[PDB]
Every structure is written in structure tokens, then in C-alpha cells.
Design a protein around this ligand. Sequence first.
Ligand code: A1IP7
Ligand code: A1IP7
Lengths: 261, 259
Amino acid sequence: MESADLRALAKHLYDSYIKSFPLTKAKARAILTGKKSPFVIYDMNSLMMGEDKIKFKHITPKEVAIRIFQGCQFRSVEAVQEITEYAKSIPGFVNLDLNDQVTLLKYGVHEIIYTMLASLMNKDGVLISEGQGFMTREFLKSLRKPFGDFMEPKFEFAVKFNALELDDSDLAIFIAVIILSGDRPGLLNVKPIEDIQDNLLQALELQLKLNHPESSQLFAKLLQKMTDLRQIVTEHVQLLQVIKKTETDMSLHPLLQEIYK
Amino acid sequence: MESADLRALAKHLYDSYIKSFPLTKAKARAILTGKTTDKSPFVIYDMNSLMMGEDKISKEVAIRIFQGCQFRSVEAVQEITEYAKSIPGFVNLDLNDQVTLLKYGVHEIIYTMLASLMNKDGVLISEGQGFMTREFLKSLRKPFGDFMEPKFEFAVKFNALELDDSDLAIFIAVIILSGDRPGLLNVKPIEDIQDNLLQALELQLKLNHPESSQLFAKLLQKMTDLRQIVTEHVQLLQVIKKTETDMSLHPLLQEIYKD
Ligand SMILES: O=C(O)c1ccc(-c2nn(C(=O)c3c(Cl)cccc3C(F)(F)F)c3cc(Cl)ccc23)c(OCc2ccccc2)c1
Ligand SMILES: O=C(O)c1ccc(-c2nn(C(=O)c3c(Cl)cccc3C(F)(F)F)c3cc(Cl)ccc23)c(OCc2ccccc2)c1
């Protein structure tokens, strides 16, 4: 690929990433650093007021720890549709076999949700409802039973990931790289997937050298984070199963259970 | 680092890798592909060929084989430790960090270098004098059968990269100098060394595999496969520990897996 084509691919992905995702990293950092302050949820009473004054669609209709956990699950489903739409803009993606498109999205969304959640996090908490709200790390970590220990690993990853100081133009290509992973189980035609990922990796490499020229070997270090992502996604799955087999108070309307399966 | 300094570091690391590891990938491939009469391995594919293999190269066969693997893993830890001492900057690090880097790194390197000894049909043993088939290992009883197969699965994919020893020497160094190991005290001096090693690996792969597009990225993505298999392995050991109460591990290995 020629250098100018890689920059074209990078710019294409950045524009689509801006249209697909409501709250960008650039805007999220402005809210987090305090540079219209978000409503802060730091305890039980502040949560109760936030749902009454603001309409947090994922924290309304039970026990608080379960409602918060389910709220994270409800937002994760919304993000899946945003990731799906963004994937359609990746050159070559919609031309892949239809089952392979579904397979790539099925096994990639968790890694991408974790990646993009870091954009909304700092060491003290996480933005919610398109940056209108802020839930503290301490409030999430203090939820009872396994729900508290379910939340903290996300902040631990995000803090490490955010030290790379990626911006949105870096992240748009990186997320594209994750989607086009040829090692997903059940892929039928790996070759066009790895061919697209090779273009995306070239575009990411050049993007990082031009956008972070003093950040030595940032490309390599970002690729090493794909290990952290896979590891934490597998831990995540094992934490859910434990919650599922233990907790008798998790029942939603069956139609809801289907949607948010 | 300048280009000539990166080439110097690659040659340094390849030199130490030859001095540290008795069975290289180059020699392993010459034995496996055959076409020679002086380095043909004896092939162990069932009980009878195993029994004859012991004369040519106590307890239940699956246990004896597992013990064979653990004994060679200990030797591998010894060879890996010796190579690590040669990586510029490693011995100058805080001593607790040296232990920590080796604790979490040796297994990822064992799996990497075990692939050199593998093809889809089996694995070289006893310094390449023997060859134990994949089917025979898979057919062991209890948990031991499924204990063997995940290694072959990784190797088939890893070997498709067609790395040679000079490539692997730098890659193995990159793995050891990982700043994200749990419990490290001084992450910065470790990451500075890894940066030079990553630069050296990058230049090495471009010169040695110029048609292999993005091989650098693809090789780094393999560190994900490595991390996963080490995790599966540790969980398989635990099942064996609670099932086989009369089976001991080497002290060096038991220290490595604790936490
Ligand atoms: O806006 C967005 O892009 C957004 C994106 C993600 C969350 C998110 N999800 N997540 C999870 O566990 C989770 C993750 Cl990482 C991956 C897959 C599935 C899950 C699932 F399914 F298990 F949920 C959180 C855990 C923590 Cl600690 C904090 C946030 C999340 C998100 O949370 C907003 C939120 C926070 C609190 C209460 C209600 C909503 C927002
Ligand atoms: O030459 C070398 O560098 C070499 C290096 C490794 C083995 C190795 N070990 N290993 C294990 O399980 C194992 C591993 Cl990976 C790490 C730590 C502890 C263990 C323990 F404790 F579980 F054993 C194998 C499983 C399979 Cl399937 C194939 C190979 C290994 C190796 O095996 C050669 C061999 C095979 C059969 C009989 C005798 C020797 C060689």
C-alpha cells in the first residue's frame, strides 16, 4: 500500500468512527478533566437522585447492585449495534462472506467494548449517558457480593490502556484491526480477512508514527495490549457464569432476557 | 538506536541463542524433513515402540511420559535462564525483577521453542534422537491425552510464520523483557530494554522476510496465543495435582507456577 492510501484509509475510518459513536474520546476527556458538569453518582442517595432528575435509561426499570450490573449489560448491547454499523464502513468488510461477518462481530465486540470503555474512564470513575453522568470507581467497587469485584478489573485495564494516550484517530484503526481478526473460531474464508487486517495494520503503524513520533515502538505496545484484551474478556466470561449460577434475583422479562442475552 | 546498532544486537542475541540452546530449529527441521541417513529419529507411536525406544535411545506409561516432559522442561528453564543473562541490561536489573521476569516468561518461551521441534504429526525428543507421534500423545488416558494436543495446535499455526533461529532469538528476548509482569518493581528500565529489542526484531524481520508483509505485527499477535496456552496448562496441572496425589513436580517448576 502506498503511504497516501494508508492516510486515506486512516481518514476514512476516523470520519466513520465519529459518526458511529456518540461520545468520542476527545469529548469524554474534556468532561473528565473538567476543561455543564456531569451529574455525579458516588453513593446510594446520589444514585437515587440521578435516576429521578436525569433519566438514565439503563438504570431505571430491586437491589441496587443488580440494577447497576444489568445497566452495564443494557449499555453493552447498545454499543454492539454501534460497533456493527462502524464495521460496515471498513473497506472490504461488507464484501466478506455473510457468516464470517457475523462471526467477526460476535467474537470481537467484547474486546472492542472494553477498549472503548477506557475512553470513558479514568482512575476515579466512568462517564455514563453520553457523558451527562459520572459514576465513581469507589461506588462501583463497593457494590456487594461479586458485583463489586466484577467492576474493578475494568478500571484496572482502562488505567493501563489510557497510559498509551491514544486519540480517536488512533483508536478508529485499532478497533478496525480487532474486528478483522482471522483467528476467530468458525471462520469460513480467512484469507480476505487477514488481507484486510494487513492493510489496517499498515495504516495503524503509519498513523502512530505520524501522530506520536516521540512515542517509540507505540505500535508494538498497542499490539501487546491485544493480549490484555483477550485475557480480560476470558476472565469476564468466567465471572458472568459465576454470577448466573449463584444469583436468584437476576430475572428480567423473558423478552428482555432474549434481547440482552 | 541506529540501524547498525540494531544489527549488532541481533547478531549478539543469535550468537548467545546458539550457545545456550543445544537443539536449534535449523537442526530440528533437518531431522524432521529427513532426506538424511545419519540423523533419522526412532519413532514412538505405541506401547511397543516406546519399550523398544527406551533400549535404542517402572510405572504407568502416561505417568512416565508426563514425567519425561517435566524433566525436560526443567532443563529448558535452565537453558532459558542462561540465555536471559546474555540479554544486554538483564543482569543489571533489580534482582527481584530478574526472578519475576523469568517466573512468568519461561513457559511462554518453552511453548515457542517447543514448536521448533513439532510438525503436524509429532514432536522430537531426546535431543532429536526420538520422535513421538501426536496421535500417541493424544491417546494417553485420564487428563494426560488432552494435555498434549493444545501444544501441537499452537505450533502448527506458529510454524506457518516460518521463523528461523535468528528471528526466534530476538523474539524470545522480547518475551522475557515484558514490563507488564505482575509484581515488577521498576517497569521503566525493563521497557527501555524491550524497546531496543522490539526495534531490533522489527528490523530483523524486514531484512530476513522482506516479502512477509506485517510479519512483525503478526508475530506479536502470537504472544496472545502463548499467554492463553500457559493459562490452560496451569489449570491442567491443578487437576493432575488433585487427582494424582503420589506425583511430584521438580522444585524449580513448582516455584515457577506458585501464583
Ligand atoms: O457507553 C459505553 O460505550 C459503555 C460501554 C460499556 C459499558 C460497560 N460495560 N461493562 C461490562 O461489564 C461489560 C464490558 Cl466492559 C464488556 C462487555 C460486556 C459487559 C457487560 F455486558 F457485562 F456489561 C462495564 C463495567 C464497568 Cl465497571 C463500567 C462500564 C461498563 C458502559 O457502562 C455504562 C454504565 C455504567 C454503569 C451503569 C450503567 C451503565 C458504557
Ligand atoms: O526439548 C525441549 O526443549 C522440550 C521442552 C518442553 C517439553 C514438554 N513439556 N511438556 C509439558 O507438559 C510441560 C511444559 Cl510444555 C512446560 C512445563 C512443564 C511441563 C510438564 F511438567 F507438564 F511436563 C510437553 C508436552 C508436550 Cl505434548 C510435548 C512436549 C512437552 C519437551 O518435551 C519433550 C518430551 C516429550 C515426551 C517425553 C519426553 C520428552 C521438550
